[model samples]
Target: SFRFGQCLIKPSVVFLKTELSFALVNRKPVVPGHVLVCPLRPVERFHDLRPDEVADLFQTTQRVGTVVEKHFHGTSLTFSMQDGPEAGQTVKHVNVHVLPRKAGDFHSWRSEEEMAAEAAALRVYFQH
Candidate 1:
Protein backbone atom coordinates (compact mmCIF):
# COMPACT_ATOMS: atom_id res chain seq x y z
CA SER A 1 0.00 0.00 0.00
CA PHE A 2 1.13 3.56 -0.78
CA ARG A 3 1.51 6.11 2.01
CA PHE A 4 0.97 9.81 1.43
CA GLY A 5 2.40 11.67 4.41
CA GLN A 6 1.14 9.68 7.43
CA CYS A 7 -1.95 8.45 5.59
CA LEU A 8 -1.91 5.14 3.80
CA ILE A 9 -3.93 4.84 0.61
CA LYS A 10 -7.15 2.91 0.98
CA PRO A 11 -8.03 0.34 -1.66
CA SER A 12 -11.71 1.19 -1.64
CA VAL A 13 -11.05 4.52 -3.37
CA VAL A 14 -8.55 3.25 -5.91
CA PHE A 15 -9.86 4.11 -9.34
CA LEU A 16 -7.12 2.49 -11.37
CA LYS A 17 -3.72 0.85 -10.91
CA THR A 18 -0.82 0.07 -13.18
CA GLU A 19 2.22 -2.01 -12.31
CA LEU A 20 4.19 1.06 -11.27
CA SER A 21 1.53 3.56 -10.33
CA PHE A 22 -2.04 4.05 -9.11
CA ALA A 23 -4.82 6.59 -9.28
CA LEU A 24 -7.31 7.29 -6.50
CA VAL A 25 -9.86 9.85 -5.37
CA ASN A 26 -8.51 12.90 -3.55
CA ARG A 27 -9.80 13.11 0.02
CA LYS A 28 -9.40 16.89 0.10
CA PRO A 29 -10.35 17.86 -3.39
CA VAL A 30 -9.96 21.29 -4.90
CA VAL A 31 -12.86 20.47 -7.20
CA PRO A 32 -15.67 17.97 -7.27
CA GLY A 33 -13.79 15.34 -9.30
CA HIS A 34 -10.19 15.94 -8.36
CA VAL A 35 -8.05 12.80 -8.18
CA LEU A 36 -4.41 11.87 -7.50
CA VAL A 37 -2.09 9.73 -9.62
CA CYS A 38 1.13 8.59 -7.97
CA PRO A 39 4.07 6.30 -8.46
CA LEU A 40 4.11 3.24 -6.22
CA ARG A 41 7.77 3.52 -5.23
CA PRO A 42 7.37 6.79 -3.29
CA VAL A 43 10.01 8.66 -5.26
CA GLU A 44 10.46 12.30 -4.24
CA ARG A 45 11.45 13.54 -7.70
CA PHE A 46 9.89 12.88 -11.09
CA HIS A 47 13.32 12.56 -12.70
CA ASP A 48 14.16 9.73 -10.32
CA LEU A 49 11.64 7.44 -12.04
CA ARG A 50 12.90 4.66 -14.27
CA PRO A 51 11.79 4.55 -17.92
CA ASP A 52 9.16 1.88 -17.28
CA GLU A 53 7.89 3.66 -14.19
CA VAL A 54 7.57 6.93 -16.13
CA ALA A 55 5.67 5.13 -18.86
CA ASP A 56 3.25 3.49 -16.45
CA LEU A 57 2.76 6.70 -14.51
CA PHE A 58 1.68 8.69 -17.54
CA GLN A 59 -0.23 5.81 -19.13
CA THR A 60 -2.19 5.45 -15.91
CA THR A 61 -2.77 9.19 -15.87
CA GLN A 62 -4.19 9.09 -19.39
CA ARG A 63 -6.48 6.24 -18.48
CA VAL A 64 -7.59 7.87 -15.23
CA GLY A 65 -8.09 11.18 -17.04
CA THR A 66 -10.65 9.56 -19.30
CA VAL A 67 -12.56 8.13 -16.38
CA VAL A 68 -12.53 11.39 -14.41
CA GLU A 69 -13.55 13.42 -17.45
CA LYS A 70 -16.42 11.15 -18.37
CA HIS A 71 -17.57 10.85 -14.77
CA PHE A 72 -17.62 14.62 -14.24
CA HIS A 73 -18.81 15.42 -17.77
CA GLY A 74 -15.76 17.65 -18.05
CA THR A 75 -14.51 19.45 -21.14
CA SER A 76 -10.87 19.59 -20.03
CA LEU A 77 -8.37 18.21 -17.54
CA THR A 78 -5.61 19.82 -15.51
CA PHE A 79 -2.82 17.30 -15.01
CA SER A 80 -0.27 18.79 -12.60
CA MET A 81 2.85 17.45 -10.98
CA GLN A 82 4.56 19.25 -8.13
CA ASP A 83 7.94 17.70 -8.58
CA GLY A 84 9.91 18.97 -5.60
CA PRO A 85 9.79 20.91 -2.35
CA GLU A 86 10.46 24.08 -4.35
CA ALA A 87 7.30 23.28 -6.29
CA GLY A 88 5.18 23.28 -3.14
CA GLN A 89 5.16 19.52 -2.82
CA THR A 90 4.23 18.91 0.80
CA VAL A 91 4.31 15.18 0.22
CA LYS A 92 7.63 13.53 -0.58
CA HIS A 93 6.18 11.18 -3.17
CA VAL A 94 5.69 12.22 -6.77
CA ASN A 95 2.02 12.75 -7.63
CA VAL A 96 0.07 14.24 -10.47
CA HIS A 97 -3.15 16.02 -9.72
CA VAL A 98 -5.83 15.07 -12.21
CA LEU A 99 -8.54 17.68 -12.11
CA PRO A 100 -11.61 17.64 -14.36
CA ARG A 101 -12.71 20.99 -15.66
CA LYS A 102 -15.96 22.12 -17.26
CA ALA A 103 -16.90 25.17 -19.33
CA GLY A 104 -18.05 27.30 -16.43
CA ASP A 105 -14.46 27.43 -15.04
CA PHE A 106 -15.55 27.60 -11.43
CA HIS A 107 -14.08 25.10 -8.96
CA SER A 108 -14.85 24.96 -5.29
CA TRP A 109 -13.25 23.01 -2.46
CA ARG A 110 -15.34 19.95 -1.82
CA SER A 111 -16.32 18.28 1.43
CA GLU A 112 -14.95 14.86 2.40
CA GLU A 113 -18.39 13.23 2.23
CA GLU A 114 -18.97 14.56 -1.29
CA MET A 115 -15.52 13.41 -2.39
CA ALA A 116 -16.14 9.94 -1.03
CA ALA A 117 -19.59 9.86 -2.64
CA GLU A 118 -18.12 10.81 -5.99
CA ALA A 119 -15.44 8.18 -5.52
CA ALA A 120 -18.05 5.52 -4.81
CA ALA A 121 -19.95 6.39 -7.97
CA LEU A 122 -16.76 6.41 -10.02
CA ARG A 123 -15.66 3.10 -8.51
CA VAL A 124 -18.91 1.54 -9.72
CA TYR A 125 -18.53 3.08 -13.18
CA PHE A 126 -14.89 2.08 -13.54
CA GLN A 127 -15.44 -1.57 -12.65
CA HIS A 128 -17.12 -2.24 -15.97
Candidate 2:
Protein backbone atom coordinates (compact mmCIF):
# COMPACT_ATOMS: atom_id res chain seq x y z
CA SER A 1 0.00 0.00 0.00
CA PHE A 2 3.00 2.30 0.39
CA ARG A 3 4.28 2.73 -3.13
CA PHE A 4 4.63 5.42 -5.84
CA GLY A 5 3.79 8.41 -3.67
CA GLN A 6 5.36 11.56 -5.09
CA CYS A 7 3.74 14.82 -6.21
CA LEU A 8 6.61 15.48 -8.63
CA ILE A 9 6.59 19.30 -8.62
CA LYS A 10 10.25 19.69 -9.67
CA PRO A 11 11.08 21.00 -13.14
CA SER A 12 14.69 19.76 -13.51
CA VAL A 13 13.23 16.46 -12.43
CA VAL A 14 10.66 16.65 -15.16
CA PHE A 15 11.90 14.63 -18.11
CA LEU A 16 9.17 15.14 -20.71
CA LYS A 17 5.87 17.08 -20.71
CA THR A 18 3.02 16.60 -23.09
CA GLU A 19 -0.69 17.36 -23.29
CA LEU A 20 -1.78 14.53 -21.01
CA SER A 21 1.39 13.33 -19.35
CA PHE A 22 4.86 14.20 -18.11
CA ALA A 23 7.93 12.19 -17.10
CA LEU A 24 10.17 12.70 -14.11
CA VAL A 25 13.58 11.36 -13.32
CA ASN A 26 13.67 10.06 -9.75
CA ARG A 27 15.11 12.68 -7.44
CA LYS A 28 16.32 9.92 -5.12
CA PRO A 29 17.38 7.74 -7.95
CA VAL A 30 17.09 4.00 -7.34
CA VAL A 31 20.42 3.74 -9.11
CA PRO A 32 21.18 6.80 -11.24
CA GLY A 33 18.86 8.80 -13.41
CA HIS A 34 16.24 6.14 -12.73
CA VAL A 35 13.10 7.74 -14.12
CA LEU A 36 9.41 7.11 -13.99
CA VAL A 37 7.09 8.47 -16.66
CA CYS A 38 3.50 8.90 -15.58
CA PRO A 39 0.26 10.43 -16.74
CA LEU A 40 -1.11 13.54 -15.08
CA ARG A 41 -4.23 11.64 -14.23
CA PRO A 42 -4.12 9.14 -11.37
CA VAL A 43 -5.04 5.64 -12.35
CA GLU A 44 -3.93 2.32 -11.01
CA ARG A 45 -4.32 0.41 -14.23
CA PHE A 46 -2.52 1.40 -17.43
CA HIS A 47 -5.50 0.43 -19.55
CA ASP A 48 -7.81 2.48 -17.36
CA LEU A 49 -5.95 5.65 -18.26
CA ARG A 50 -6.86 7.64 -21.38
CA PRO A 51 -5.35 6.68 -24.71
CA ASP A 52 -3.54 10.02 -25.01
CA GLU A 53 -2.02 9.46 -21.61
CA VAL A 54 -0.88 6.01 -22.65
CA ALA A 55 0.68 7.38 -25.80
CA ASP A 56 2.55 10.12 -23.96
CA LEU A 57 3.64 7.70 -21.27
CA PHE A 58 5.33 5.56 -23.89
CA GLN A 59 6.79 8.58 -25.69
CA THR A 60 8.28 9.84 -22.46
CA THR A 61 9.64 6.39 -21.78
CA GLN A 62 11.59 6.67 -25.02
CA ARG A 63 12.95 10.13 -24.25
CA VAL A 64 14.26 8.93 -20.89
CA GLY A 65 16.88 7.02 -22.92
CA THR A 66 18.47 10.31 -23.96
CA VAL A 67 18.41 11.53 -20.40
CA VAL A 68 20.29 8.44 -19.26
CA GLU A 69 22.79 8.69 -22.10
CA LYS A 70 23.53 12.32 -21.33
CA HIS A 71 23.63 12.21 -17.55
CA PHE A 72 24.59 8.64 -16.59
CA HIS A 73 27.35 8.36 -19.19
CA GLY A 74 25.52 5.25 -20.29
CA THR A 75 25.76 3.84 -23.75
CA SER A 76 22.14 2.71 -23.57
CA LEU A 77 19.00 2.67 -21.38
CA THR A 78 16.35 0.11 -20.51
CA PHE A 79 12.57 0.47 -20.39
CA SER A 80 10.08 -1.48 -18.30
CA MET A 81 6.54 -0.95 -17.01
CA GLN A 82 4.61 -3.64 -15.25
CA ASP A 83 1.28 -4.61 -16.67
CA GLY A 84 0.30 -5.97 -13.25
CA PRO A 85 1.85 -7.71 -10.30
CA GLU A 86 1.82 -10.83 -12.39
CA ALA A 87 4.22 -9.14 -14.74
CA GLY A 88 6.62 -7.77 -12.08
CA GLN A 89 4.65 -4.61 -11.47
CA THR A 90 5.28 -4.35 -7.76
CA VAL A 91 3.49 -1.04 -7.52
CA LYS A 92 -0.04 -0.79 -8.82
CA HIS A 93 0.50 2.63 -10.38
CA VAL A 94 0.64 2.95 -14.15
CA ASN A 95 4.21 4.03 -14.66
CA VAL A 96 7.31 3.06 -16.55
CA HIS A 97 10.80 2.48 -15.13
CA VAL A 98 13.63 4.04 -17.16
CA LEU A 99 16.68 2.21 -15.85
CA PRO A 100 19.96 3.92 -16.65
CA ARG A 101 22.27 1.33 -18.16
CA LYS A 102 25.60 0.68 -19.77
CA ALA A 103 27.69 -2.40 -20.63
CA GLY A 104 26.95 -3.89 -17.20
CA ASP A 105 24.37 -1.99 -15.22
CA PHE A 106 22.15 -5.01 -14.92
CA HIS A 107 19.72 -4.68 -11.99
CA SER A 108 19.67 -8.02 -10.12
CA TRP A 109 19.61 -10.34 -13.05
CA ARG A 110 23.34 -11.00 -13.28
CA SER A 111 25.54 -13.43 -11.40
CA GLU A 112 28.30 -12.23 -9.06
CA GLU A 113 31.07 -12.86 -11.57
CA GLU A 114 29.06 -11.19 -14.30
CA MET A 115 28.52 -8.15 -12.13
CA ALA A 116 32.21 -8.02 -11.26
CA ALA A 117 33.21 -8.16 -14.90
CA GLU A 118 30.60 -5.60 -15.81
CA ALA A 119 31.64 -3.24 -13.08
CA ALA A 120 35.19 -3.30 -14.32
CA ALA A 121 34.12 -2.84 -17.91
CA LEU A 122 31.75 -0.02 -17.01
CA ARG A 123 34.32 1.70 -14.86
CA VAL A 124 36.75 1.66 -17.74
CA TYR A 125 34.16 2.97 -20.16
CA PHE A 126 33.02 5.76 -17.86
CA GLN A 127 36.55 7.12 -17.72
CA HIS A 128 35.97 8.45 -21.22
Candidate 3:
Protein backbone atom coordinates (compact mmCIF):
# COMPACT_ATOMS: atom_id res chain seq x y z
CA SER A 1 0.00 0.00 0.00
CA PHE A 2 0.98 3.63 -0.54
CA ARG A 3 0.22 6.60 1.68
CA PHE A 4 -1.41 9.86 0.67
CA GLY A 5 -1.69 12.02 3.75
CA GLN A 6 -3.82 9.83 6.06
CA CYS A 7 -5.37 7.78 3.28
CA LEU A 8 -3.85 4.47 2.31
CA ILE A 9 -3.93 3.10 -1.23
CA LYS A 10 -4.18 -0.59 -1.79
CA PRO A 11 -3.20 -2.40 -4.99
CA SER A 12 -6.80 -2.50 -6.18
CA VAL A 13 -7.44 1.24 -6.22
CA VAL A 14 -4.75 1.86 -8.79
CA PHE A 15 -6.28 1.61 -12.24
CA LEU A 16 -3.34 2.64 -14.38
CA LYS A 17 0.43 2.77 -14.20
CA THR A 18 3.20 3.66 -16.63
CA GLU A 19 6.97 3.91 -16.41
CA LEU A 20 6.69 7.56 -15.36
CA SER A 21 3.35 7.72 -13.59
CA PHE A 22 0.39 5.93 -11.99
CA ALA A 23 -3.34 6.68 -11.70
CA LEU A 24 -5.43 6.09 -8.59
CA VAL A 25 -9.10 6.37 -7.70
CA ASN A 26 -9.86 9.45 -5.68
CA ARG A 27 -11.11 9.07 -2.12
CA LYS A 28 -13.67 11.66 -1.00
CA PRO A 29 -14.16 12.44 -4.65
CA VAL A 30 -15.93 15.58 -5.80
CA VAL A 31 -17.66 13.48 -8.41
CA PRO A 32 -18.35 9.83 -8.96
CA GLY A 33 -15.35 7.99 -10.42
CA HIS A 34 -12.98 10.88 -9.86
CA VAL A 35 -9.41 9.83 -10.47
CA LEU A 36 -5.99 11.19 -9.74
CA VAL A 37 -3.08 10.85 -12.17
CA CYS A 38 0.34 11.54 -10.75
CA PRO A 39 3.91 11.28 -11.90
CA LEU A 40 5.91 8.64 -10.04
CA ARG A 41 8.94 10.83 -9.77
CA PRO A 42 7.68 13.26 -7.18
CA VAL A 43 8.47 16.76 -8.22
CA GLU A 44 6.15 19.53 -7.04
CA ARG A 45 5.39 21.48 -10.21
CA PHE A 46 4.28 20.54 -13.71
CA HIS A 47 7.42 22.26 -15.00
CA ASP A 48 9.46 19.98 -12.76
CA LEU A 49 8.47 16.99 -14.88
CA ARG A 50 10.78 16.02 -17.73
CA PRO A 51 9.26 16.19 -21.21
CA ASP A 52 8.86 12.44 -21.47
CA GLU A 53 7.13 12.26 -18.09
CA VAL A 54 4.78 15.07 -19.08
CA ALA A 55 3.73 13.17 -22.16
CA ASP A 56 3.21 9.97 -20.20
CA LEU A 57 1.24 11.75 -17.52
CA PHE A 58 -1.31 13.25 -19.88
CA GLN A 59 -1.53 10.14 -22.02
CA THR A 60 -2.34 8.16 -18.92
CA THR A 61 -4.87 10.77 -17.92
CA GLN A 62 -6.57 10.48 -21.29
CA ARG A 63 -7.06 6.73 -20.93
CA VAL A 64 -8.29 7.06 -17.36
CA GLY A 65 -10.53 9.93 -18.39
CA THR A 66 -12.12 7.83 -21.11
CA VAL A 67 -12.84 4.95 -18.74
CA VAL A 68 -14.11 7.22 -15.98
CA GLU A 69 -16.52 9.00 -18.25
CA LYS A 70 -17.86 5.77 -19.68
CA HIS A 71 -18.10 3.90 -16.41
CA PHE A 72 -19.64 6.81 -14.53
CA HIS A 73 -22.19 7.55 -17.24
CA GLY A 74 -20.89 11.06 -17.51
CA THR A 75 -21.75 13.53 -20.26
CA SER A 76 -18.34 15.23 -20.08
CA LEU A 77 -15.21 15.45 -18.03
CA THR A 78 -13.02 18.01 -16.31
CA PHE A 79 -9.24 17.82 -16.28
CA SER A 80 -7.66 19.95 -13.58
CA MET A 81 -4.18 20.42 -12.23
CA GLN A 82 -3.21 22.32 -9.13
CA ASP A 83 0.41 22.77 -10.12
CA GLY A 84 1.55 24.72 -7.12
CA PRO A 85 0.62 25.36 -3.50
CA GLU A 86 -0.79 28.78 -4.28
CA ALA A 87 -3.00 27.11 -6.87
CA GLY A 88 -4.50 24.72 -4.24
CA GLN A 89 -2.21 21.72 -4.46
CA THR A 90 -2.52 20.33 -0.97
CA VAL A 91 -0.06 17.54 -1.58
CA LYS A 92 3.50 18.20 -2.71
CA HIS A 93 3.19 15.73 -5.57
CA VAL A 94 2.07 16.95 -8.98
CA ASN A 95 -1.14 15.29 -10.14
CA VAL A 96 -4.11 15.89 -12.40
CA HIS A 97 -7.71 15.69 -11.24
CA VAL A 98 -9.84 13.86 -13.81
CA LEU A 99 -13.50 14.16 -12.88
CA PRO A 100 -16.42 12.77 -14.84
CA ARG A 101 -18.77 15.71 -15.26
CA LYS A 102 -22.35 14.64 -14.90
CA ALA A 103 -24.58 17.67 -15.33
CA GLY A 104 -26.54 19.51 -12.60
CA ASP A 105 -24.40 18.34 -9.69
CA PHE A 106 -22.12 20.37 -7.45
CA HIS A 107 -21.38 18.32 -4.33
CA SER A 108 -19.76 15.03 -3.33
CA TRP A 109 -20.29 12.66 -0.39
CA ARG A 110 -19.25 9.15 -1.22
CA SER A 111 -18.42 6.82 1.61
CA GLU A 112 -15.11 4.97 1.60
CA GLU A 113 -16.96 1.76 0.82
CA GLU A 114 -18.76 3.32 -2.13
CA MET A 115 -15.52 4.76 -3.47
CA ALA A 116 -13.94 1.34 -3.12
CA ALA A 117 -16.69 -0.27 -5.15
CA GLU A 118 -16.23 2.25 -7.94
CA ALA A 119 -12.49 1.82 -7.76
CA ALA A 120 -12.90 -1.92 -7.94
CA ALA A 121 -14.88 -1.59 -11.13
CA LEU A 122 -12.28 0.68 -12.67
CA ARG A 123 -9.57 -1.69 -11.58
CA VAL A 124 -11.29 -4.56 -13.34
CA TYR A 125 -11.89 -2.49 -16.46
CA PHE A 126 -8.27 -1.42 -16.70
CA GLN A 127 -6.84 -4.78 -15.64
CA HIS A 128 -7.70 -6.11 -19.04
For each candidate, the alpha-carbon lDDT, in order, equals: 0.81, 0.61, 0.82
RMSD to the hidden true structure, all candidates:
2.4, 9.4, 2.5
lDDT of 2 at 6: 43
Q: Tens digits of per-residue lDDT for model 2 on 1-128? A: 11243443444335356677665545445666566777777677778987777777777667656656676687777787777777886545778877777675664343444433433333342244
Model 3 residue runs over 4 Å out of place are 3-8, 107-113
Q: Report how far off residue 92 is in candidate 1 (Å).
A: 0.8
Each prediction's total of clashing residue pairs, residues at least 3 apart in sequence or on different chains, is: 0, 0, 0
Cα lDDT over the full model 3: 0.82
What lDDT would candidate 2 get against the real structure? Answer: 0.61
Colliding residue pairs in candidate 1? none
Cα lDDT of candidate 1 equals 0.81
Model 2 misplaced regions, further than 4 Å: 1-12, 86-91, 107-128
lDDT of model 2 at position 72: 68
lDDT of 3 at 26: 75
Given candidate 3, what's the lDDT at residue 89?
Answer: 85
